[PDB]
Amino acid sequence: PMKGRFPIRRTLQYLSQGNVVFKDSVKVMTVNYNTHGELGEGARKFVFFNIPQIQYKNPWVQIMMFKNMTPSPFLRFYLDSGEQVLVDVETKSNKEIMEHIRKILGKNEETLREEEEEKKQLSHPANFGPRKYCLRECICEVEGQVPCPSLVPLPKEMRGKYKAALKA
Amino acid sequence: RKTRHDPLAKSKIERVNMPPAVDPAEFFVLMERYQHYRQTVRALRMEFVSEVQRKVHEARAGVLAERKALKDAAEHR
Amino acid sequence: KKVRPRLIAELARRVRALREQLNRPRDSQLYAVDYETLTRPFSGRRLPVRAW
Amino acid sequence: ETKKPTFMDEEVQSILTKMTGLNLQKTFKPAIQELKPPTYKLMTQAQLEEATRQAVEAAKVRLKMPPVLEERVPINDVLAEDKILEGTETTKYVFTDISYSIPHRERFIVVREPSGTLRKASWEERDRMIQVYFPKEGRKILTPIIFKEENLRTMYSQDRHVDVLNLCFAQFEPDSTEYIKVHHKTYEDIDKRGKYDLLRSTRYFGGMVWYFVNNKKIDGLLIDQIQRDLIDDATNLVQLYHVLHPDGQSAQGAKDQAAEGINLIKVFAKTEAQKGAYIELTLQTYQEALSRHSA
Amino acid sequence: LTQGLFRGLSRQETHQQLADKKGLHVVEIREECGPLPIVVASPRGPLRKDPEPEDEVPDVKLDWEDVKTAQGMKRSVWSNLKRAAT
Amino acid sequence: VPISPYKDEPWKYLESEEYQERYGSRPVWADYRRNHKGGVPPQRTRKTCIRRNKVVGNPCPICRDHKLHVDFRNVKLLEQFVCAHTGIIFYAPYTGVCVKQHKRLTQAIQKARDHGLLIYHIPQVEPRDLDFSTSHGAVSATPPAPTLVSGDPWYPWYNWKQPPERELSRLRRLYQGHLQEESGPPPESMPKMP
Amino acid sequence: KAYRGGHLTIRLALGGCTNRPFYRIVAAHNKCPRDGRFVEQLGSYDPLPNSHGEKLVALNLDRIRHWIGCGAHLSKPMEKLLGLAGFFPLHPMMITNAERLRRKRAREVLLASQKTDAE
Amino acid sequence: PYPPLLRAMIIAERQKNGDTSTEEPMLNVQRIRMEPWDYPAKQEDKGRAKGTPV
Numbered sequence A: 001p002m003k004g005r006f007p008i009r010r011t012l013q014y015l016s017q018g019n020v021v022f023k024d025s026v027k028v029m030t031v032n033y034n035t036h037g038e039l040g041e042g043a044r045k046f047v048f049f050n051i052p053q054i055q056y057k058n059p060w061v062q063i064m065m066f067k068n069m070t071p072s073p074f075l076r077f078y079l080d081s082g083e084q085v086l087v088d089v090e091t092k093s094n095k096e097i098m099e100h101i102r103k104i105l106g107k108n109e110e111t112l113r114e115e116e117e118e119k120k121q122l123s124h125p126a127n128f129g130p131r132k133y134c135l136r137e138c139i140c141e142v143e144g145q146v147p148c149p150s151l152v153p154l155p156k157e158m159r160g161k162y163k164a165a166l167k168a
Numbered sequence B: 001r002k003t004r005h006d007p008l009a010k011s012k013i014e015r016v017n018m019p020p021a022v023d024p025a026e027f028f029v030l031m032e033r034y035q036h037y038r039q040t041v042r043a044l045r046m047e048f049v050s051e052v053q054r055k056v057h058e059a060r061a062g063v064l065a066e067r068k069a070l071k072d073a074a075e076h077r
Numbered sequence C: 001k002k003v004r005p006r007l008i009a010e011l012a013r014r015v016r017a018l019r020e021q022l023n024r025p026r027d028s029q030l031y032a033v034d035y036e037t038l039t040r041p042f043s044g045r046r047l048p049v050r051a052w
Numbered sequence D: 001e002t003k004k005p006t007f008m009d010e011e012v013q014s015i016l017t018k019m020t021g022l023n024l025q026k027t028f029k030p031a032i033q034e035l036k037p038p039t040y041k042l043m044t045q046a047q048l049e050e051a052t053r054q055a056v057e058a059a060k061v062r063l064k065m066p067p068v069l070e071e072r073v074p075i076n077d078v079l080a081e082d083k084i085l086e087g088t089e090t091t092k093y094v095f096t097d098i099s100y101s102i103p104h105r106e107r108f109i110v111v112r113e114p115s116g117t118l119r120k121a122s123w124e125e126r127d128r129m130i131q132v133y134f135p136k137e138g139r140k141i142l143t144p145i146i147f148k149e150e151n152l153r154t155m156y157s158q159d160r161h162v163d164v165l166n167l168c169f170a171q172f173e174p175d176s177t178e179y180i181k182v183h184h185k186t187y188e189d190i191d192k193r194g195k196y197d198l199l200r201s202t203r204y205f206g207g208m209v210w211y212f213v214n215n216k217k218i219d220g221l222l223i224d225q226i227q228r229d230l231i232d233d234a235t236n237l238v239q240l241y242h243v244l245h246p247d248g249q250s251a252q253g254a255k256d257q258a259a260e261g262i263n264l265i266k267v268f269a270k271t272e273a274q275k276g277a278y279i280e281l282t283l284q285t286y287q288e289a290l291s292r293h294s295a
Numbered sequence E: 001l002t003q004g005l006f007r008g009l010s011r012q013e014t015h016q017q018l019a020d021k022k023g024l025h026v027v028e029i030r031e032e033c034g035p036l037p038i039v040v041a042s043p044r045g046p047l048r049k050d051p052e053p054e055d056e057v058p059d060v061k062l063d064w065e066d067v068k069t070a071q072g073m074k075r076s077v078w079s080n081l082k083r084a085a086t
Numbered sequence F: 001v002p003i004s005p006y007k008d009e010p011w012k013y014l015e016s017e018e019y020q021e022r023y024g025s026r027p028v029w030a031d032y033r034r035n036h037k038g039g040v041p042p043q044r045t046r047k048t049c050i051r052r053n054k055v056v057g058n059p060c061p062i063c064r065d066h067k068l069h070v071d072f073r074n075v076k077l078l079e080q081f082v083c084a085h086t087g088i089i090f091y092a093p094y095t096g097v098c099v100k101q102h103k104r105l106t107q108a109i110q111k112a113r114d115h116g117l118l119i120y121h122i123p124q125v126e127p128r129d130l131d132f133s134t135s136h137g138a139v140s141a142t143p144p145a146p147t148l149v150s151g152d153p154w155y156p157w158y159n160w161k162q163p164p165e166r167e168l169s170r171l172r173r174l175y176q177g178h179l180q181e182e183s184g185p186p187p188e189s190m191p192k193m194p
Numbered sequence G: 001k002a003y004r005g006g007h008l009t010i011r012l013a014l015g016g017c018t019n020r021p022f023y024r025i026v027a028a029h030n031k032c033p034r035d036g037r038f039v040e041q042l043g044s045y046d047p048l049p050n051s052h053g054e055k056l057v058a059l060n061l062d063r064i065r066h067w068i069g070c071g072a073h074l075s076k077p078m079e080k081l082l083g084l085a086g087f088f089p090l091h092p093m094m095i096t097n098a099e100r101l102r103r104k105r106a107r108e109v110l111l112a113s114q115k116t117d118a119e
Numbered sequence H: 001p002y003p004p005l006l007r008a009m010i011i012a013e014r015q016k017n018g019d020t021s022t023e024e025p026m027l028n029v030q031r032i033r034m035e036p037w038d039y040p041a042k043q044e045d046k047g048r049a050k051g052t053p054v
Ligand code: FES
Pocket: A137, A138, A139, A140, A141, A147, A148, A149, A150, G016, G017, G020, G022
């Protein structure tokens, strides 16, 4: 089996289940959690499950964690303008923390659709080329157009061998 | 193709490419067609050049772009 | 990522530029023309046939 | 003044939606395709009711009737005539604007003929050229040979009328001349062989009822509904018929007699329906049998 | 391999046993049939009114061989080879 | 020489008693096995089982019986090479047929689906366009340009214009000894060879 | 790659197999190879007639107008494809070569006529 | 005038945006001053032959 407890976390399907895509402002995210106490349980589960999901969607955002530095857990974001966003996550579940930071600092579903639509204009279907980039390589794959000579030999009248021989 | 340091062939030492014969009518008529064609294509080019400035200037300093930067900044506060 | 310097490539560049400015050919050499063979003795290049 | 309701009106869609009906077993019929192992969920009585409610919401998105349009007008528009280019080429050029962010019905497709004429591509040329640069799954550049009369009849013989309509919807446009002929042929065959049930619980039923009501061929359909204890749908079909044809013998008679429910079928059967006698006999049997059940 | 195959194939729980054990409906979901819920088994006894508590993450032991295949990492020139009908 | 009598009507052989006594209810390839080394066979079958009117040692299901004709009308035989649960044509190693007959089956299986003889899954696709209006100028009429109404070219320079004598005189002097015969105005329309 | 000088040009990039030419309109650097690296593909041209008898020319007008406003030049073959479409004016040599062919074909009708008349 | 297709696409934007007009689109070629090919150029941006006598 897969080593470690809850091995589903080490899967690409689970890392892509995150719904927290930060904005361009968010540069640094700091998590302060306490190893023990009932109140801090949500923060521990947020560091155990959701932090991998947040870092996978935001690979350019720094995420640093500190243990037992304060009496209560809290999240603090450092924006590019110099503003700091404190988020007291005590007496809260990990789902509440994940839903709270997606509303104050995360993107909505409207801004995310547009991003995907801008990437659909990069791969034009009309364009011809390798399968990696384009659907078709040549226009001989289109029914009606003259087929490739490899598959269907062209007529002797359309080849430069006989044209040269016929002319001279 | 050759480089600058490669010597010329010895078969081309005495080669003179004589200019083509000229038909006065066709030549004069074609010299005016080019004059107009290039004048019509310069005007079209300028139009296309002005559309690239606008779009560029309509996304960073546009009325619909500055109306969204304030909505995004107002929702942040 | 520390590029090893190429000193001879900078010395030659300066020397070549200097020589091009002290040995530069004049207009008398460049634009002289022999009127029988219609060539430029400096470069041995024939002029075009419409200029002869 | 007084406009006759169209096919997309809320009042008409609700009537044709109810006639169609909803059958999950037929709407979500097991497709023959590549398979994966199923997933199981331990559900309660209430979790199963919500799951069946979500399937009914998804079946109503799959039964969305396509709009019925009229035969599009041919494109005969010349942009330029250049007589100096005549004889300089043997074949014609077809230029297409393959700009992505443009609807295909606003896309410019021109044809430079060997006579120097720069015209607009015809509908058949537009649709074909749009499948070369914007290919759509299901559509083919060259019209398939199944839409021929001999091949279509073979399909009709196997009660595969819904497959002919699905192939036509994926090959032709709603306002084509081949999409309207292929549909009418299917509807005409259904009326002849009484195969109305095949299109039931599908998205092609409303269009079949709209073709009969406008061409006055609802006698057979009404009989089928009566023979399946569907009087509710049978009465709305006459009501819809009346609306589209207000100045008719049946419509005027109704107003005079204020006919309702089963009465409308009787009024319609005599005044306008071609097979008036058969409708009464079929309707009679139903009413007699219903009385026994009521007892 | 023979004594272990008969052992595991005899200790498998059916859908009816699962329903009776948990007093719930076993619903089959198929891509071919879309979202339609197919009830394959129902409890003969009293149907439970309370649903099973949803689990955010399940602590079930996984197999690297299966995770490595779904993520396109199990390269082998002997898998998915064309063979005869069995 | 084997001259099968079902050449024209191949579907009558599968509904006969000679077929039922040999195959029964199973497919024709049920009782066929390939001969090869190892447990893993080659990923491709033999090109063909018949070479210059000569059959090989172990003919395939289609080549061992000369009465089995791969035609698009013989739907009962083509259903044995298509899965009844996924509608996919089996690869050659599955049934054991040669590349030549597997290529002829695929063509007959694809040609029976194009004639409505073979049932196959036809999905319900969505419309190509979100709108259906035909009011745009691309599909409608454009105001004809003035030049098109007057029977004139789009631009004047398209037409030939005779140049003045003084200008031709400059060119002649400019190109002394390197001239060509002056060209007259071209014909209004392209001539054709009678 | 960095080239000394140069500019962008909307040209044709030859493709296809022997005796089956297929060009694909591209915007590419002047010094780059014909079929090498390109900035963008702006269309395709199939010279060979199809079953319907027509030559297909796909043009991304929106993107062709963008690169022309950014400093892109045009090749003669590509300036003759835009003249036939109606995007540009008919190239001067397209009008002059059509006149030369007329005079030529009118010169052949005389010889043919004389032969049939005199003989 | 604009060339035929460009003109057809400028008259379709108008009618799409709602503008109704019968005016022709025309190019202002008064700015474009077409100079002759034999017009004196700038010799102060022109190069000189390199000193490699042969
Ligand atoms: S690939 Fe198109 S011709 Fe060979």
